[PDB]
């Protein structure tokens, strides 16, 4: 019977020519010799155990397996098998091991597995099984191990699972099981490891779990249990590991947990626990890991601390709202490797005793209020790899002893008040991968020793007071991703050795005094992502920076860069922000910016660019800001700018643009600043400009506009600055203008050819601070409301053709405000003869 059955499923477990089970053919007919099979040792033949794991099988499990009434160990683990678990294994009552783990199995766990009461270990996890856990599993009273982890199983933990009196390991983590944890598991009394981590248990932890005298491991992390931690769990005296992290637990931490004499790790981080840390914990000799971070605890470290914590390796109390100073008593925990007190409200100095903790690898004191100095005793922590002190108010020089730390990897001192030189021996800390000292008051040169730090991937010295050159030695730090020396006082040229930083993604050098050409070697930096060289004294061409594609932001504002803008900037499709302002660049704007789909802010102001705006930039639909001021650009304002629906600020002033304003432009309904002053635009102003309802600033000065002023300009209700001076406008000023209630900064109509009366409605301009109508041809008398203007500070109406006795509102405006008007007499001027 059974040698038919053995070759039967080799058909279903391998639907293929190639057989890892090659030995299973009727040609070698003694099946006991075959790979993976074991026959009875008693001479009656038949199969007792099958071991097929690590074979790489990709097929299915079949009901013919159930035919073996003498199978005791079935192991199909750690293959890639597919399909359901056959309920036909119902029939193999003789089975004592069932291992299906680490496959790709599907379906629910069969109800009928409950009839295998002589089973001892069941492992079917690391599969994609989908059902609720069947309550029949409680029948398997002989079971010592049950693993259902890392699948897709649902529903409550069956409470009629407490019948499994003799189970030693219960493994349910990494599923979707939900509801309360049953009190009935108190009756599983040889239980020693129990994990239901990474599930959805939503009850409170039953106190009946204190019942389990032999429990050594308890792990319910990453769940959603609520309530207070039962003090009855102090009764679990064989326990070594407790984690309840990442739940929604409430209340004060129970004081009994010190009664767990064998406890090696206690983790209750990431809950809503409160109260103080029970001082009983400081008497827990055998504890290794105490982590209580991110709980709304209260109070401060008592001087009882480390009273009897001889074995403690890791103490984590960050984000626990602790107050007070660091205890000198904490140096009694001489064994301690990792101390984390960050993200608290600690004060005072760092105690000199804490450099007695010579086994420390990690010291976290950041984001407190600590003051004082960093002691040269830091050399004693010779094993330290992460030293993290940022966002404190530490001061003074930085110890030259920091150079004894040959295993140091991370040095975070930023946002303190440190001062003086960086230690010239800093390069002795060869292991260093990240150095951040931003925001201090470090002075003097950057240590050339830093070029010893081959592992260095981050260097950040920004916002200090450092002086002198950029050290060529830094070109030896080949693994640098971010180099940021901005906001200093650095001088000299960039050294051509920086071309050796082939993996560098961010280069920030802005706000310094760097000078001279960029070295041609920077072309090798083809992984660059963000550059900012702004506000320096660099010259030569920017071509060496465009060896990289994949820029996100490229800033060189305010330098002395010369020649043409490289068309290669187009290579960075994802360039969000391009700033070349305040340089000496020449030639036309490059068409290839049209390749930059992601361009949003373009600034080329204050260069010597010539030509026109390339049509291809219509492709940059995300543009919100264009700044081309103070160039030598020519030709019309291109109507395709209206296709930039997102354009909020268009600055084209002090160029040589030369014709009429296109109607298309006013499809840019999101414009807030349109300034085109200082060009040579001609023609009239279009009615459709009122289409710009959001517009805040309109400045058309020092062009040569013509004709009358549109009635639609009263539509710009949000406009606070209006400048149209030094044009040739010809009409009378519209009564519709009084609708611009938000005008504040200026209303400048000077040096035009306006005629008629000044409209009485201008006095309606409640918030306008400056009104200039000088050098026109306006007539009549000034309406007096204009003199009373509540917010007005400057008034000039000189060089018009007005007359009469000035209404008495105009006292203490100066005579200079009414100059050149023959035939005007009044309060500030001469008497009416």
């Amino acid at each position: 019977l059974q040698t038919l059955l053995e070759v039967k499923k080799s058909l279903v477990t391998n639907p293929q020519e190639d057989d890892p089970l090659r030995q299973w053919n009727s040609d070698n007919i003694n099946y006991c010799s075959w790979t993976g099979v074991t026959c009875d040792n008693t001479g009656l033949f038949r199969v007792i155990a099958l071991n097929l794991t690590g074979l790489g099988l990709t097929g299915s499990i079949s009901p013919w397996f159930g035919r073996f009434d003498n199978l005791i160990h079935l192991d199909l683990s750690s293959n890639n098998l597919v399909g359901p678990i056959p309920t036909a294994l119902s029939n193999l009552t003789s089975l004592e091991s069932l291992f299906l783990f680490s496959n790709q199995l599907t379906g629910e766990i069969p109800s009928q597995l409950g009839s295998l009461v002589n089973i001892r270990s069941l492992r079917i996890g690391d599969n994609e099984l989908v059902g609720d856990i069947p309550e029949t599993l409680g029948n398997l009273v002989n079971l010592q191990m049950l693993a259902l982890a890392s699948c897709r199983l649902t529903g409550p933990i069956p409470s009629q699972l407490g019948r499994l009196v003799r189970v030693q390991s219960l493994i349910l983590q990494d599923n979707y099981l939900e509801g309360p944890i049953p009190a009935e598991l108190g009756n599983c009394s040889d239980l020693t490891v129990f994990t239901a981590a990474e599930n959805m248990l939503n009850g409170t932890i039953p106190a009946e779990l204190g019942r389990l005298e032999n429990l050594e491991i308890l792990n319910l992390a990453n769940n959603s249990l609520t309530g207070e931690i039962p003090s009855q769990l102090g009764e679990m005296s064989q326990l070594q590991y407790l984690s309840l992290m990442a739940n929604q637990l409430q209340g004060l931490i129970p004081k009994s947990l010190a009664d767990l004499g064998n406890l090696q790790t206690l983790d209750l981080s990431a809950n809503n626990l409160t109260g103080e840390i029970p001082e009983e914990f400081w008497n827990m000799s055998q504890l290794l890991d105490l982590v209580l971070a991110n709980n709304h605890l209260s109070g401060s470290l008592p001087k009882s601390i480390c009273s009897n914590n001889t074995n403690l390796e890791q103490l984590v109390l960050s984000g626990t709202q602790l107050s007070g100073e660091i205890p000198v008593e904490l140096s009694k925990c001489q064994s301690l490797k990792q101390l984390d007190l960050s993200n608290n409200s600690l004060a005072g100095s760092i105690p000199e005793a804490l450099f007695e903790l010579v086994e420390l690898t990690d010291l976290y004191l950041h984001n407190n209020t600590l003051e004082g100095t960093l002691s040269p005793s830091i050399s004693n922590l010779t094993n330290l790899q992460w030293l993290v002190l940022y966002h404190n108010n530490l001061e003074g020089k930085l110890p030259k002893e920091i150079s004894a730390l040959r295993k140091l990897e991370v040095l975070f001192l930023y946002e303190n008040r440190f001062s003086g030189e960086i230690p010239q021996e800093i390069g002795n800390c060869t292991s260093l991968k990240m150095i951040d000292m931003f925001g201090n008051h470090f002075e003097g040169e950057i240590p050339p020793s830093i070029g010893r730090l081959k592992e260095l991937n981050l260097l950040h010295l920004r916002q200090n007071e450092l002086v002198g050159g950029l050290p060529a030695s830094l070109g030896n730090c080949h693994q640098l991703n971010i180099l940021d020396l901005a906001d200093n006082q650095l001088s000299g040229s960039i050294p051509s050795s920086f071309g050796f930083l082939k993996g560098l993604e961010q280069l920030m050098l802005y706000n310094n005094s760097l000078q001279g050409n960029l070295p041609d070697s920077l072309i090798s930096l083809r992984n660059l992502t963000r550059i900012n060289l702004s506000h320096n004294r660099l010259n030569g061409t920017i071509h060496p920076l465009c060896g990289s594609s994949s820029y996100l932001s490229f800033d060189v504002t305010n330098n002395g860069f010369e020649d043409e803008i490289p068309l290669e900037l187009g290579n960075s499709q994802n360039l969000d922000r391009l700033r070349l302002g305040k340089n000496q660049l020449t030639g036309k704007i490059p068409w290839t910016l049209g390749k930059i789909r992601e361009l949003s802010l373009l600034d080329m102001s204050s260069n010597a660019l010539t030509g026109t705006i390339p049509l291809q930039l219509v492709l940059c639909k995300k543009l919100t800001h264009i700044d081309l001021n103070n160039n030598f650009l020519s030709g019309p304002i291109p109507p395709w700018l209206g296709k930039l629906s997102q354009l909020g600020e268009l600055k084209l002033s002090s160029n040589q643009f030369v014709e009429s304003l296109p109607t298309e432009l006013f499809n840019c309904t999101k414009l807030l600043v349109l300034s085109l002053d200082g060009n040579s635009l001609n023609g009239s102003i279009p009615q459709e400009i009122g289409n710009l309802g959001a517009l805040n600033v309109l400045n058309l000065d020092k062009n040569q506009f013509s004709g009358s002023l549109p009635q639609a300009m009263g539509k710009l209700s949000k406009l606070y600055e209006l400048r149209l001076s030094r044009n040739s406008l010809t009409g009378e000023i519209p009564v519709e203008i009084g609708q611009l209630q938000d005008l504040q900064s200026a209303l400048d109509l000077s040096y035009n050819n306006f005629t008629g009366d000044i409209p009485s409605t201008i006095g309606t301009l409640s918030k306008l601070e400056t009104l200039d109508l000088s050098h026109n041809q306006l007539t009549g008398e000034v309406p007096g409301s204009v003199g009373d203007m509540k917010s007005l500070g400057y008034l000039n109406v000189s060089f018009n053709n007005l007359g009469g006795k000035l209404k008495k509102q105009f006292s203490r405006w100066p005579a200079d405000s009414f100059l050149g008007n023959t035939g005007l007499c009044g309060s500030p001027l001469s008497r009416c003869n």
Binding site: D126, N219, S243, S269, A293, Y364, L458
Partner: peptide, 21 residues
């Protein structure tokens, strides 16, 4: 694949300051 059944508590690793870009 399977996860550890009682892992040793590991420290968070805190950030370097940056926001300029």
């Amino acid at each position: 694949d399977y996860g550890h059944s009682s892992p040793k508590p590991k420290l968070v690793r805190p950030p370097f300051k940056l926001i300029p870009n």
